[PDB]
Amino acid sequence: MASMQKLINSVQNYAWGSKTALTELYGIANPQQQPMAELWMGAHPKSSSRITTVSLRDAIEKNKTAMLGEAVANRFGELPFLFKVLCAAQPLSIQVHPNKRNSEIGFAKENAAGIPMDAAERNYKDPNHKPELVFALTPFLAMNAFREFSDIVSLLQPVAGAHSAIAHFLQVPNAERLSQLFASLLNMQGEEKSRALAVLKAALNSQQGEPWQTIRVISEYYPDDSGLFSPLLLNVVKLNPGEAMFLFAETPHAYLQGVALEVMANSDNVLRAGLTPKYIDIPELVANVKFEPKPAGELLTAPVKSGAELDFPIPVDDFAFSLHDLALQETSIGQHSAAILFCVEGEAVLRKDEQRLVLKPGESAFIGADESPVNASGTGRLARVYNKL
């Protein structure tokens, strides 16, 4: 193993992935025009990155302290982050990540039931909650958290007659009635559901702009989904490149279009909340959602610039994320932990003593804790996932 290891990374060819994005952005080969949904950078047991070839997982397993650093070897016992490029060419499902206590419970329920971790029925893979950070690489359309009540009221007007639960909320717009509204919409069946959707679709022809536009787009993929009402309840966000959001527990969100970097745990817990053909346990979902608005001005995470470094402070010990402006003069990039460095744009030259490693856009390198620091020079920006402990 050299000081700096250029990663060979997995691309997950999920059907919702873009056939072109990784190629357009990074020159990643795709002669067969497969959907390319996620590019994984990390040591996940199902699909670890490789180094020159051996599994990064396997390499770390053989000297955790040297590779991870003492702090991470102590606190986590494994690489504590998975770093992805996500390319959403179709709108994805609305999801909720349960809080710590409910995660402990769900994890235990599933273990007690003997559900394999890998089963498609398995919803809880960690007895904990860790936030997730999403950072836009191209303009990125998403939903995140409930709108202020007055916003929801205004948006539900044109569809007040779609369902009695909508009328009920409008009569007294509060958290309790929002919860009831959310549950009622998800539980609509048969003609009740079709009538509600008919009202909404008629509205889509007499309302202009957002979120009505987002509903139109989603309806091309989920034309019979009660989740079509969701943009009226949840904030629709359009991230410009370089903007980011942190997904809090107990909060519905959805990735709808575009390319983003995602920093997340290796193992997470997901409850679905719409835009899915799958079964939803509504009582469980509702018991794990906080029906409280989040103001639009609070949706983006505010980064902090210090010299050439832009940190995105994350309220969790597990992982940290920064962007580094490259210059032709070297700057030192150092950390107490394993790091993954990813060239966002431009070109990065990494140097450790006499070793040099060039990263073109879309390429990444793993730096073991023992090998910090490395000097970076070039043009553009380098993204870093690491651990601050």
Side-chain angles (χ1 to χ4, degrees), residues 1-26:
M1 273 183 299
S3 275
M4 309 179 288
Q5 286 284 345
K6 190 174 177 184
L7 287 170
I8 298 158
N9 299 307
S10 294
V11 176
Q12 308 297 323
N13 300 129
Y14 304 137
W16 53 263
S18 168
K19 298 183 181 184
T20 60
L22 292 187
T23 310
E24 293 174 278
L25 287 172
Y26 310 129

Short mmCIF file of all heavy atoms in Angstrom, two decimals, residues 1-26:
data_model
loop_
_atom_site.label_atom_id
_atom_site.label_comp_id
_atom_site.label_asym_id
_atom_site.label_seq_id
_atom_site.Cartn_x
_atom_site.Cartn_y
_atom_site.Cartn_z
N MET A 1 0.83 -1.24 0.00
CA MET A 1 0.00 0.00 0.00
C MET A 1 0.85 1.27 0.00
O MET A 1 1.68 1.48 0.90
CB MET A 1 -0.95 0.02 1.20
CG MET A 1 -2.30 -0.69 0.99
SD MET A 1 -3.41 -0.56 2.42
CE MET A 1 -2.45 -1.38 3.69
N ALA A 2 0.63 2.11 -1.01
CA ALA A 2 1.23 3.45 -1.08
C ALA A 2 0.55 4.39 -0.10
O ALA A 2 -0.50 4.06 0.46
CB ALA A 2 1.12 3.99 -2.49
N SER A 3 1.14 5.56 0.10
CA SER A 3 0.60 6.53 1.04
C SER A 3 -0.83 6.89 0.68
O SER A 3 -1.71 6.95 1.53
CB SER A 3 1.43 7.80 1.01
OG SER A 3 2.55 7.70 1.87
N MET A 4 -1.03 7.17 -0.61
CA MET A 4 -2.33 7.60 -1.11
C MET A 4 -2.86 6.59 -2.10
O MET A 4 -2.19 6.27 -3.09
CB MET A 4 -2.19 8.96 -1.79
CG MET A 4 -1.47 9.98 -0.93
SD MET A 4 -1.30 11.55 -1.77
CE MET A 4 -0.05 11.12 -2.98
N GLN A 5 -4.07 6.09 -1.87
CA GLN A 5 -4.61 5.00 -2.67
C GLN A 5 -5.77 5.45 -3.57
O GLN A 5 -6.84 5.80 -3.08
CB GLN A 5 -5.05 3.84 -1.77
CG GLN A 5 -3.89 3.02 -1.18
CD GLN A 5 -3.24 2.06 -2.19
OE1 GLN A 5 -3.79 1.78 -3.26
NE2 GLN A 5 -2.06 1.55 -1.85
N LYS A 6 -5.55 5.44 -4.88
CA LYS A 6 -6.62 5.76 -5.81
C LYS A 6 -7.72 4.70 -5.75
O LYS A 6 -7.45 3.50 -5.84
CB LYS A 6 -6.11 5.91 -7.24
CG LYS A 6 -7.17 6.49 -8.16
CD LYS A 6 -6.56 6.76 -9.54
CE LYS A 6 -7.60 7.27 -10.52
NZ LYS A 6 -6.97 7.43 -11.86
N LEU A 7 -8.96 5.14 -5.57
CA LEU A 7 -10.02 4.17 -5.34
C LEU A 7 -10.60 3.63 -6.63
O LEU A 7 -10.77 4.38 -7.59
CB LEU A 7 -11.16 4.80 -4.53
CG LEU A 7 -10.80 5.01 -3.06
CD1 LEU A 7 -11.86 5.87 -2.37
CD2 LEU A 7 -10.63 3.68 -2.33
N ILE A 8 -10.89 2.34 -6.63
CA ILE A 8 -11.76 1.75 -7.64
C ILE A 8 -13.14 1.60 -7.01
O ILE A 8 -13.34 0.82 -6.06
CB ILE A 8 -11.27 0.37 -8.08
CG1 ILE A 8 -9.89 0.48 -8.73
CG2 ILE A 8 -12.28 -0.22 -9.05
CD1 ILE A 8 -9.10 -0.84 -8.71
N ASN A 9 -14.10 2.36 -7.53
CA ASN A 9 -15.41 2.48 -6.89
C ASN A 9 -16.57 1.79 -7.61
O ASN A 9 -16.61 1.74 -8.83
CB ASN A 9 -15.73 3.96 -6.72
CG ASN A 9 -14.73 4.66 -5.85
OD1 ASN A 9 -14.47 4.21 -4.73
ND2 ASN A 9 -14.13 5.74 -6.36
N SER A 10 -17.52 1.29 -6.83
CA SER A 10 -18.69 0.61 -7.37
C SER A 10 -19.73 1.57 -7.91
O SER A 10 -20.04 2.58 -7.28
CB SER A 10 -19.34 -0.22 -6.27
OG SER A 10 -18.46 -1.26 -5.90
N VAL A 11 -20.32 1.23 -9.05
CA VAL A 11 -21.49 1.94 -9.54
C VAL A 11 -22.69 1.00 -9.48
O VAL A 11 -22.66 -0.08 -10.09
CB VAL A 11 -21.31 2.42 -10.98
CG1 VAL A 11 -22.59 3.07 -11.45
CG2 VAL A 11 -20.14 3.43 -11.07
N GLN A 12 -23.72 1.41 -8.76
CA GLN A 12 -24.94 0.60 -8.63
C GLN A 12 -25.87 0.96 -9.77
O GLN A 12 -26.30 2.12 -9.88
CB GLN A 12 -25.68 0.90 -7.32
CG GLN A 12 -24.85 0.83 -6.05
CD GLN A 12 -24.30 -0.56 -5.80
OE1 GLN A 12 -24.96 -1.56 -6.07
NE2 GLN A 12 -23.08 -0.62 -5.27
N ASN A 13 -26.20 -0.03 -10.59
CA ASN A 13 -27.01 0.22 -11.79
C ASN A 13 -28.51 0.06 -11.51
O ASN A 13 -29.20 -0.70 -12.20
CB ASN A 13 -26.55 -0.69 -12.93
CG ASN A 13 -25.11 -0.46 -13.30
OD1 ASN A 13 -24.31 -1.40 -13.37
ND2 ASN A 13 -24.75 0.80 -13.48
N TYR A 14 -29.00 0.77 -10.49
CA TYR A 14 -30.43 0.70 -10.14
C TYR A 14 -31.23 1.32 -11.28
O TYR A 14 -30.75 2.23 -11.95
CB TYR A 14 -30.75 1.43 -8.82
CG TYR A 14 -29.96 0.98 -7.60
CD1 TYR A 14 -29.46 1.93 -6.71
CD2 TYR A 14 -29.74 -0.36 -7.32
CE1 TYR A 14 -28.75 1.55 -5.58
CE2 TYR A 14 -29.03 -0.75 -6.18
CZ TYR A 14 -28.53 0.21 -5.32
OH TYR A 14 -27.82 -0.15 -4.19
N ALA A 15 -32.46 0.86 -11.48
CA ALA A 15 -33.23 1.24 -12.67
C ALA A 15 -33.56 2.72 -12.76
O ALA A 15 -33.78 3.24 -13.86
CB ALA A 15 -34.51 0.42 -12.76
N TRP A 16 -33.60 3.40 -11.62
CA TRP A 16 -33.88 4.84 -11.57
C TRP A 16 -32.69 5.75 -11.90
O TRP A 16 -32.83 6.97 -11.95
CB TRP A 16 -34.46 5.23 -10.21
CG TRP A 16 -33.68 4.80 -9.00
CD1 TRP A 16 -33.90 3.69 -8.23
CD2 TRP A 16 -32.57 5.48 -8.41
NE1 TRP A 16 -33.00 3.65 -7.20
CE2 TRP A 16 -32.17 4.74 -7.28
CE3 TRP A 16 -31.88 6.66 -8.72
CZ2 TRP A 16 -31.10 5.13 -6.46
CZ3 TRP A 16 -30.81 7.04 -7.91
CH2 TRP A 16 -30.45 6.28 -6.79
N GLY A 17 -31.52 5.16 -12.11
CA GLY A 17 -30.31 5.93 -12.32
C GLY A 17 -30.28 6.58 -13.68
O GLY A 17 -30.99 6.17 -14.60
N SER A 18 -29.44 7.60 -13.83
CA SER A 18 -29.28 8.26 -15.11
C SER A 18 -28.37 7.42 -16.00
O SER A 18 -27.34 6.90 -15.56
CB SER A 18 -28.66 9.64 -14.90
OG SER A 18 -28.24 10.23 -16.12
N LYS A 19 -28.73 7.30 -17.28
CA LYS A 19 -27.87 6.59 -18.22
C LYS A 19 -26.65 7.39 -18.68
O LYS A 19 -25.73 6.84 -19.29
CB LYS A 19 -28.68 6.10 -19.42
CG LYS A 19 -29.76 5.12 -19.03
CD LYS A 19 -30.51 4.60 -20.25
CE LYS A 19 -31.61 3.63 -19.82
NZ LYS A 19 -32.29 3.03 -21.02
N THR A 20 -26.63 8.69 -18.39
CA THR A 20 -25.64 9.60 -18.98
C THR A 20 -24.82 10.44 -17.99
O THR A 20 -23.69 10.83 -18.30
CB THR A 20 -26.33 10.58 -19.94
OG1 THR A 20 -27.31 11.33 -19.20
CG2 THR A 20 -27.03 9.80 -21.04
N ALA A 21 -25.39 10.73 -16.81
CA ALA A 21 -24.81 11.72 -15.89
C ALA A 21 -23.37 11.45 -15.50
O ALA A 21 -22.52 12.35 -15.61
CB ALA A 21 -25.70 11.91 -14.65
N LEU A 22 -23.06 10.24 -15.04
CA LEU A 22 -21.68 9.98 -14.63
C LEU A 22 -20.73 10.10 -15.82
O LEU A 22 -19.57 10.50 -15.67
CB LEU A 22 -21.52 8.61 -13.98
CG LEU A 22 -22.19 8.43 -12.61
CD1 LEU A 22 -21.82 7.08 -11.99
CD2 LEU A 22 -21.84 9.56 -11.63
N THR A 23 -21.22 9.74 -17.00
CA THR A 23 -20.41 9.89 -18.21
C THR A 23 -20.19 11.36 -18.61
O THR A 23 -19.06 11.77 -18.87
CB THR A 23 -21.01 9.12 -19.39
OG1 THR A 23 -21.30 7.77 -19.00
CG2 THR A 23 -20.02 9.10 -20.54
N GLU A 24 -21.27 12.13 -18.65
CA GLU A 24 -21.22 13.56 -18.95
C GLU A 24 -20.29 14.30 -17.99
O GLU A 24 -19.46 15.11 -18.40
CB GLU A 24 -22.61 14.19 -18.82
CG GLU A 24 -23.66 13.78 -19.84
CD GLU A 24 -25.03 14.36 -19.49
OE1 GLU A 24 -25.75 13.79 -18.64
OE2 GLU A 24 -25.37 15.42 -20.06
N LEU A 25 -20.44 14.04 -16.69
CA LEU A 25 -19.72 14.78 -15.67
C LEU A 25 -18.26 14.35 -15.58
O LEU A 25 -17.36 15.20 -15.48
CB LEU A 25 -20.40 14.57 -14.31
CG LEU A 25 -21.73 15.30 -14.12
CD1 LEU A 25 -22.41 14.87 -12.83
CD2 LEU A 25 -21.52 16.82 -14.13
N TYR A 26 -18.04 13.04 -15.62
CA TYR A 26 -16.76 12.44 -15.24
C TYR A 26 -16.12 11.49 -16.24
O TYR A 26 -15.06 10.92 -15.95
CB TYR A 26 -16.92 11.69 -13.92
CG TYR A 26 -17.60 12.51 -12.85
CD1 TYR A 26 -18.68 11.99 -12.15
CD2 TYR A 26 -17.14 13.79 -12.52
CE1 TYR A 26 -19.30 12.73 -11.16
CE2 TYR A 26 -17.77 14.54 -11.53
CZ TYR A 26 -18.85 14.00 -10.85
OH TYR A 26 -19.48 14.71 -9.87
#
